[PDB]
Design a protein around this ligand. Structure first.
Ligand SMILES: CC(=O)c1c(C)[nH]c(C(=O)N[C@H]2CCCC[C@H]2n2cc(CO)nn2)c1C
Length: 106
C-alpha cells in the first residue's frame, strides 16, 4: 500500500541520515563553495530535502522516493572522483541504500 511504502521510506531515510558515510549528503551542496556545482548538476538532491518532502506528503509512491535517493548518488558519481572522500562515501551510501531497499520491498 502507499502507507506501507511510505512507512518503509521513512525508516530507510532515518538509517541513511544516521550512517557514518552520510556526511556529504545531509544538506544541499552550497554552490558558493563548490565551483561548477550549480552549473553542472541540473537536479541537486540531498537527505534534508528528501526529509522535508517526505514529511509533507511530497512522495506519493516509494518509486519516486528512490528516484530522489538515486539522484543523490548519481550526482555524487558525476561530480566527484572515485578516490575522493565524497566520492567514496557516495559509493558506500549507494550500496547501503540498495541493500536496505531490497530488504524492505522485496
Ligand atoms: C561536490 C559534491 O558532490 C559534494 C557533496 C555531495 N557534498 C559535499 C560536501 O559536503 N562539501 C563540504 C566539504 C568542503 C566543501 C564544502 C562543504 N560544503 C558544505 C556545503 C553546505 O552544506 N556545501 N559544501 C560536496 C563537495
Amino acid at each position: 500500500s502507499m502507507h506501507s511504502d511510505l512507512t518503509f521510506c521513512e525508516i530507510i531515510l532515518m538509517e541513511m541520515e544516521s550512517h557514518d558515510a552520510a556526511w556529504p549528503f545531509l544538506e544541499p551542496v552550497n554552490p558558493r563553495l563548490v565551483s561548477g556545482y550549480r552549473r553542472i548538476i541540473k537536479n541537486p538532491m540531498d537527505f534534508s530535502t528528501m526529509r522535508h518532502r517526505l514529511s509533507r506528503g511530497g512522495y506519493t509512491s516509494s518509486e519516486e522516493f528512490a528516484a530522489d535517493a538515486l539522484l543523490v548518488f548519481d550526482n555524487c558519481q558525476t561530480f566527484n572522483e572515485d578516490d575522493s572522500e565524497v566520492g567514496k562515501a557516495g559509493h558506500i551510501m549507494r550500496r547501503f541504500f540498495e541493500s536496505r531497499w531490497e530488504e524492505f520491498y522485496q
